[model samples]
Target chain A: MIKGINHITYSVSNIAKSIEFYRDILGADILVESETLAYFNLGGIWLALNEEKNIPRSEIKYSYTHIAFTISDNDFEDWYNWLKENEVNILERDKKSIYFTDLDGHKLELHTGSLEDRLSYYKEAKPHMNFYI
Target chain B: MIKGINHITYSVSNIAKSIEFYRDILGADILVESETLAYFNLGGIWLALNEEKNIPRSEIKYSYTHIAFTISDNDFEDWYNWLKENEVNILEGRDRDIRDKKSIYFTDLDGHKLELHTGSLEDRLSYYKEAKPHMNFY
Candidate 1:
C-alpha cells in the first residue's frame, strides 16, 4: 500500500532561471544540482527540476495541470506583496487563495486551505456532503 | 510565501472513469464529485481530476512531469503485481531513478505518468551530498 506522496518532478525549460525562481523566490531549499537534474525540498516533499533534451523549452506549452501549496490566512498580505514585487505571473484569485504560473508555465497555487478544511466547510455549510464521507 | 502543498489537480479525459480508478484501485477517499470535477484524498494529498479542455491527451504523455508516491521497501513486491494485475500501462519497469531507491514509472487511465518510489528526501540527500554538486553550499 502507498503511504503518501513522496515528491514531484517537473521537466523545466530553463535550468538556471528555474532554479533561481524556486530558490530565491519560493524559498525552496537547494539539495543539489546534478548533471541530470536539480532537487529541492518543498517543505517535506522532494521536488526535482529537470532539463531534458527530449522535451525542449521551445516546444513546451501551457496546461491546466497544477500543484498547490498551503499558506496561512494571516500571511496573505505578505505573500501578495512578495508575488507582486517579484512580478510573478498571477493566474487567478479565489477568495484568500491565489493562482500563479512558474517560469515554465506550470500552474501553481498558494491556497489558504486544506482537505480537512474543505470537508469541514462542506459539513457545516451544506447538507448531503456527508453522503460521500 | 508558501507553506507546503495542499492539493494537486490533473486534467483527465474522463471524469467518471478517473474517479472510479482512483477510488477503487488507488484507495482514494472520495471528498466530492462535482459536475465537472472530482476531488479525492489519496493518502494525504488532495487530488482533483478535471474534465475540461487544455492539452490533448496525446500531449500529456510527452511531458516528463509526474507525481510520485512513497511506498515501503517491503511492499514493493505486492505493489508490482498489484499494478500489473490491474492492467496499468507501465512506461518503465522497476528501476532506480535518483540513487538506488527502486522507482517504477507508470501512467494513469489517461496516460498521465505516475511513479512509485521507495525512499524519502533525507535518504536521497545523504547519498546525493557525495555525488552531486550543491548550488548554494559553496
Candidate 2:
C-alpha cells in the first residue's frame, strides 16, 4: 500500500517559534494552523509541526537523519548567504553542500543534485556499492 | 532556491537489514547499496538509509517525527494483511479510516515511526475547512 511520501511531522518544543521559523525564515507557505499543530506547504510536501511540550528543551537530541532541500547551482550562494544572515546553525560545507539545523536541532541540508545525479555518482564513485542505477 | 525536498536520510542501525526491509517489505525501488548506506525510491521521494551512526540506536531520542507514505485506498486492506503476515511490528494496524483516510501506523526495524496513509494534503484540507473552521487558514 505504501506509495510516495505524503507528509512529515516534526515534534516541536515551541510550536509558535517553530511556525515562525518555517514560515518566515524557510519561506514555507503556511497552509493551516491550530493551537496544537501547524501545517506548511514545504517545497510541495506537506510538513506538520506538532506541539510536544512534555520533552524538555534540554532533553531534545539529534542525529544523522536529515531532510535535504533542493537548491539550484545559480541560487545556491544566495540561499547560503541568506541562511547565514538569518543565523541558521550551518555545520558543514563540503561535498558541494551545506548542512544545518532547525530551531529544534533537526538536521537539514541544501542539496544541489537530484536523485538521478546521486545514483549516478554512487555507481562511479563507490564501486564497492551495489550498482542499480 | 529551495523548490522542494530533495531527499531524506534516515539513520539505520544496519544497512543490510534496512535495505531488505525497504526493498522487499516496503517494495521500494532501491537504486544503490553498500555496507554503510543504501538508496531507495519511494514514489519519487529519495530515501537514503544511512548506517553511519551519530549515536547508539537505542540512545536516539526519537520524537513524534515520522514519514507518512501515500497509499491507494483499495490496496489498504491486503497491504495490512501482508504487513502482519511478514511479522512486521505494527504499532497501530487495522485502525482504518481515521482522519478521513485509511492509514496504518507502524515502525521500521530501527524504530523509526512510519505511516501508510491514503489521504493527500488536498483531501485533508477539505476536512479542515468544514470541521475545523476555527483553525487559522494561512
Candidate 3:
C-alpha cells in the first residue's frame, strides 16, 4: 500500500539556477545537490529537481494544474511583498494566495489555507471553477 | 513562508477512471468529486486530478519528473505482487538503488509515471554524507 508523498520531481533546464530560485529565494533546505539531480526539503516534503535537456519544456500558461504550498494567514502579505521585491514572476493574485511560475516554468502557488479549509471549500462549493480554497 | 505541499494537481483524460485508479486501487481517500475535478487525500498530501483534454499526455517512459509515494520496507514485495494481480502497468521492475532503498515504477491510466519508493529523506541524506566527495556538482 502507498503512504503519503515522498517527493515531487520536476524537470529543470539549469540546475544551478533552479537551486538559487528554490533555495535562496523560496527558502527550501538543500538536502543533496549534484550536477544532474538535486533534492530539497521544502516544509517536510522532498522536492527533487532534475536537469533533463531532452525532455520537452512544459507550457503551462493555460494549464490549470499546479502545486500549491501552504502558508500561514499572517505570513501571506509578507510573502507577497518579498516576492514582489525580489522580482519573481507573478501570474495571478488574490486575498488568500499568490500564483507564480518557477524558473522552469512550472506553475506554483503559495496559499494561506489549511487542509481543513480546502476540504471545507470542496464540500461547500462542489465543483468550483478555480483552484482557490 | 511556504509550509510543505498542499497538493499536486494532474491533468487526467477521464475523471472516472482516475478516481477508480487512485481511490479504489491506490486506496486514496476521496475528499471531493465532481465532473471537472476530484481531490483525494493520499495519506497527508492532497492529490488533485483535473479533467483537461487540452493538456498533453505524459510520456513517462523518458520523463525525469514523477511523483513518488512512500511504502514500508516489508510491504515492497507485497505491493509488487498486488500491482501484478490488479493488471497495473509496470514501467520498471523493483530495484535497489545505490542508496540501499527499494523502488518500483509504474504509470497511471493517463500515462503519468508513479513511483512506490521505500526511502525516506534520512536515507538519502545519510547516503549523501558518505558519498558527497565522489559526487560531481558540475
The candidate maximizing lDDT is 2
**lDDT tens digits by residue: candidate 3, B2-76:** 777877888788888988998887888887777888777887777889898866654445556678999999998
* Structural similarity to truth (TM-score) of each candidate: 0.88, 0.91, 0.87
Which stretches of candidate 2 lie above 4 Å from their native place?
Answer: A56-62, A93-95, B58-62, B93-99
Q: What value does the lDDT take at residue B82 in candidate 3?
A: 85
Tell me the deviation in Å of residue B52 in model 1: 1.4
Model 2, global lDDT: 0.80
Residue range with the least summed lDDT across 10 consecutive positions in model 3 chain A: A124-133
User: What CAPRI-style quality would you assign to candidate 1?
Assistant: medium
lDDT score, candidate 3, position B11: 77
When sorted by DockQ, best at the front, the candidate numbers are: 2, 1, 3
Alpha-carbon shift of residue B90 in model 1 (angstroms) = 1.0
When summed lDDT is taken over every stretch of 10 residues in candidate 2 chain A, the lowest stretch is A54-63
**Candidate 3, residue A27: lDDT:** 94
- Top TM-score: which candidate number? 2
lDDT of 2 at B21: 89
Cα error, candidate 2, residue B134 (Å): 3.7
Clashing pairs in 2: none
Please give the TM-score of chain B in predicted model 2. Answer: 0.86
